[PDB]
Structures are given as C-alpha cells and as structure tokens.
Design a protein around this ligand. Structure first.
Ligand code: V2M
Ligand code: V2M
Lengths: 303, 302
C-alpha cells in the first residue's frame, strides 16, 4: 500500500543525455541513433535571443560550430537541420545505448517523468503533468534546457517533452520532440504569460479514489449529482469539464471501491463548496490533480 | 526555480537489480561486484514466516537452493552467508554495471531515492524521507522486498535502505545494506507498531531558509535562543530535538542567507507558539519537513 508521485526509471534516458555547445551557449541534447536533438536557441548569442531569425542564424552555421560531448567523448557533427524549435545534429557515431523509443505528443492532464540535466549530466527525476494551460510545474535552473520528459511502457521509452523556458510565474514550458511548443509560447527571450490554468478534474477524482483505497473515506457523502450539475459547479471553480469518457476511464477505480463516479463527484462538489476544513487527504492540504487514473491504478490495484 | 520532491536518476541502480528465488518465494536482490544482497526471509516458507529461526533455516540451505536471475539469465551461486537480516549470495559473475558505491546508514530526517522493483524489474522511482520513528511513507506492493533506497553524489551510489516490511498503519520499514533494521522492527510476519512520529525540525528550518532565499522572510524575528531552550520547546509541539549534526548541516544555508541557525530556531519557535495567523510560507500554510538542507541548496543553487 501507500501512494506517492512516482516516475518511471530513468536509466534508459540517462544513457542518451549529451551536452551541446555553440559559442558560449550550452544546453543538453538527446542522442538517439546518429542524431542529437536539442533546443534550437543554442545557436543564439546573448543578443540574438531577443528576436532570433532562426532560419537566418542556422544557414550561417557550420557543422564544426557545434560541440557535442557525450560524457568525456566528443561526437563529430556531420550535418544539421531544424524541425520547428528543435535542432537535429547528425553525428558520426550512433548511440549504442539507444533504447526502443517513440516520439509522442502528450495530452493535457497526462503525466510524464522529467529527467533534469545540466551540462549533459542527469541530476534528478520527478513526475509532472501537462497542465490544461500547457505549462508544467517543474524544478529547472539555468542550463536545464534540453532536459526531456518521458514515459516507459515495458521497454519502449516514449519521449514527449523537451525543456525550453521558465515563465515569470515560475512554471515551465517546452516542446514535443518534433519541436512544437505545448501552449502558445515562443522561443524568444521575452516574458510570456500562459492562459488561465484550470484543474484536472478527472485526476482529482482518481486521487480521491486513491484516498478511499488507502482507508480515507471522511470526505464521502450520501448525496449524488448529475454529470451536468457537477460540471456547472466545476466550471464555476475553474475545473475542467468531466466527460463521459472520463467517467468510463474511472470505471475500474469505481468498481474497486464500489463508489459510483457520480457519487465521488458529489463528494468533490461538497469539498469545493465546503472546503476540507483543515483536514488532509492522502497527506495533502490541497486537492491534488497531478495523478492520472492510470497512475492511481498502478499503485492501488490489489490493495 | 521550483521546488519538487526530486529523486536521483535511477540508472546506476537499475543495472544492479536482480531476482532471488528460494522455493516459491521470490523477491529482489542487489548485484554488486560478485555478491547479491537480499532480505534473508527469502529462505522462509509461507507457513514458516510466523517466528522463523533464521540460523537453523539457513543450515538447511545450500548454494544450489538459490535461484538468482538477472533478467532471465541465471547467476550461479557459489557461496552464501547471513549478516543480520540480509543474505549475501556470492555468485560466479562480477556485475559489469557495478557503479562506484558505498554502504551508508542514514539518520532520521534524511532523504533518499527509492527504486521500486518487482521480480527484479525496476518499476518506479520516488523520493522518501526517513521519519523520526524510522518509517518511510512509500508505495510498496507484494513482491517489493529487496528494493533499495540510495543517494548519488557525483558518480558514487550510497545505498542506505533495503525494503522488508509494511506496517499495519500503511508505512514501511526496512534495513540498511548491512541488514540492520532502522527502528525497532524485526523481519517476521507480525503486526508491529512504530513509535509516535514527530516533525523533522532540521528540515523545517531548511524549508525556512529556502523561503528566505526566495525573498519570503516575514517570519524572521528579533529573538535568538539556546539550542537547549529550543529543544525543550520543540518537544512540546511534537518536533524532533536538534543535534549538533543538525546545526552543522544547516551551516551552508545559514551562511548563504546571513541568518544564524539559532536565530532561525527562534523564528521557528515563534511560529510554533503563535501559529501562522493566516499567513503562508512559500505559498503554503503548512510547514514542510521532507526537504533536507542539501535538497534546498540543490534546488536553489544547482
Ligand atoms: C534554458 O536553459 C536556456 O538554454 C533556459 C531554461 C531556464 C532558465 C531558468 N529556469 C529554466 O527553466 N531557458 C531560457 O532561458 C529561455 C531561453 C529561450 C530563448 C526561450 N528563456 C526563458 O526561459 C525566459 C526569458 C524570460 C524573460 O525575458 C526577458 C522575462 C521573464 C521570464 C523569462 N524566462
Ligand atoms: C516483501 O515483498 C516480502 O518479500 C513484503 C513487503 C510488502 C508487501 C506489501 N506491501 C509491502 O511493502 N514483505 C512482507 O510481506 C513482510 C514479510 C516479513 C518480512 C517476513 N511482512 C509484512 O510486511 C507484514 C506482516 C504483517 C502482519 O503479520 C501477520 C500483520 C499486519 C501487517 C503486516 N505486514
């Protein structure tokens, strides 16, 4: 038993992390087969980042302008190209530790593991959720760009995020591995705001089921609600709407606890209107929304 | 910026997890050099775990009774021994993925990464804090014994925890890599209770230093205190007493912010006696006690 935010093992990703340097600008790259993926703004200087014409700055660069370091060995760049905001550097050596992998664009509300790296060296790993406003609440410092987010299904690593930016509010923004940003952000040195953040309702419900499976039932109530009436209250409290697909996705958790999804909605409705009154749920004083139904099932099945 | 419960990358430990099976009992082992370490109760039968005499049980075991597998490849056992609650199985193959490592016994309050493992296959990694009552609030299922907790300094892996037991309350207990249980538990199929838990004072102070570093410093007062006066006060609010080592590992943060440790102790004392008065610290009205002074520096420095 027990329930904590838990990331997939990062070993298969650590073996792909490299360092990319152009001028006095350094960040992390991802080395899969004979191509290294990194944020394209590595080709910028301090002055270029204010408003960079990347296509312009890229044609003016030569292969030998890119220093790529895999641990202690230097990889030779034998070609370069740009796909959206991601620079792709072909190299003379294929990474022998390349795992079975795929590039996936994650949906808002879904979770992934983040391997924070600095100077091409892994530093830490933690779970994040792609929030509705397409930011993530991570822990990134200077030099963390190029760090990637991922999940692992059996032995296949699905890469879904590469880090680029920290917003003024302290949250973080990035691209998928095709170089497309999540959210309306742009890779220029400007202060950018995200859209209004909402709470991932299906995740809050799943996390409440995790509390019941771990013995916490104090928030339950005898009342029930309709899907529409719950959504009215949810939208009022800046919660994402709950769809029938979400109700279907919550089925297994409902069958294990014997609590109908719409019964848990009434319990969440009361929590939103009455509050927790100082009480805690699974140790938290706030309603947690960064656990997916999958995340919960994978720690609370059999308990 | 940003504060997360962050775990060390698990790759150096993933390459060391194996599966150990005796009869039908399977759990996880740690393969370092030519030795596999694992919980000794792997030699017990289902009905035998009520009050095992591990010394007699081991007498009835030979090298050929132990099935050690890295993946599906069997590692031949060429010797066996018992050290406290851990079994050391000498194997014929030295693990080529063995990292530079050491065995450490952590103190209550310190944090470490836990690599959840099942049938020798890593499944997840998360960060834990060793409670003052020698328990960790983790996520462990059937088959998780033998999973290890660890820290990584540069390229050295410091192993500090091997999982053994889930308590009736849902928290977990285990040993260091020398087989010595953290806390007053024993490897036996019985419901054992942990001592009443307390708040990790040293970590709360680290958290306050973190708030100061970020410009959130309303709680700094004009008082100071002796270490003894603070301890006696802290024990009345279910807070751990501080040691000399606790004062010492707050040194870097005290020097970074210019706030003497005992001045911050006096600030904490005020918060304990008078509450927060609706105010928040780093966006929360609850004082957090699962980040060590090192975790704070790592996430404010780099
Ligand atoms: C990468 O490491 C750059 O290689 C870096 C990521 C962080 C720095 C601190 N915390 C992080 O996660 N990314 C940046 O510095 C990006 C650069 C590219 C061009 C987008 N810039 C920002 O993240 C950024 C710029 C500004 C800003 O301007 C002026 C004003 C306010 C916030 C801000 N963030
Ligand atoms: C290991 O996997 C055993 O190999 C297993 C750990 C977990 C199982 C589920 N969640 C875990 O963390 N360990 C045990 O089952 C141990 C075996 C001991 C070391 C011999 N037993 C317990 O942890 C345990 C026993 C009892 C009990 O008795 C009866 C009564 C109440 C709780 C309890 N926990």
């Amino acid at each position: 038993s027990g329930f904590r935010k838990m990331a997939f093992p990062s070993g298969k990703v650590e073996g792909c992390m490299v360092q990319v340097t152009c001028g006095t600008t350094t960040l992390n790259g991802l080395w899969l087969d004979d191509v290294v993926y990194c944020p394209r703004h590595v080709i910028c200087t301090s002055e270029d980042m204010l408003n960079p014409n990347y296509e312009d700055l890229l044609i003016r660069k030569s292969n030998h302008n890119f220093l790529v370091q895999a641990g202690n060995v230097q990889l030779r760049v034998i070609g370069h190209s740009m796909q959206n905001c991601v620079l792709k550097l072909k190299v003379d050596t294929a990474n022998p530790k390349t795992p079975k992998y795929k590039f996936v664009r994650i949906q808002p509300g879904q979770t992934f593991a983040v391997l924070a790296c600095y100077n091409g060296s892994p530093s830490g790993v933690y779970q994040c959720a792609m929030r509705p406003n397409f930011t993530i609440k991570g822990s990134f410092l200077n030099g963390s760009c190029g760090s990637v987010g991922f999940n692992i299904d059996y032995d296949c690593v699905s890469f879904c995020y590469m880090h680029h930016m920290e917003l003024p509010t302290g949250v973080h923004a990035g691209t998928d591995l095709e170089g497309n940003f999540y959210g309306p952000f742009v890779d220029r040195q400007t202060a950018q705001a995200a859209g209004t953040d909402t709470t991932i309702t299906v995740n809050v419900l799943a996390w409440l089921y995790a509390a019941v499976i771990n013995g916490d039932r104090w928030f339950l109530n005898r009342f029930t609600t309709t899907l529409n009436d719950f959504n009215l209250v949810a939208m009022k409290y800046n919660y994402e709407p709950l769809t029938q697909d979400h109700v279907d996705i919550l089925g297994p958790l409902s069958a294990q606890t014997g609590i109908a999804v719409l019964d848990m909605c009434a319990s969440l409705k009361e929590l939103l209107q009455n509050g927790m009154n100082g009480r805690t749920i699974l140790g938290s004083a706030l309603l947690e929304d960064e656990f997916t139904p999958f995340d919960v099932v994978r720690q609370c099945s059999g308990v």
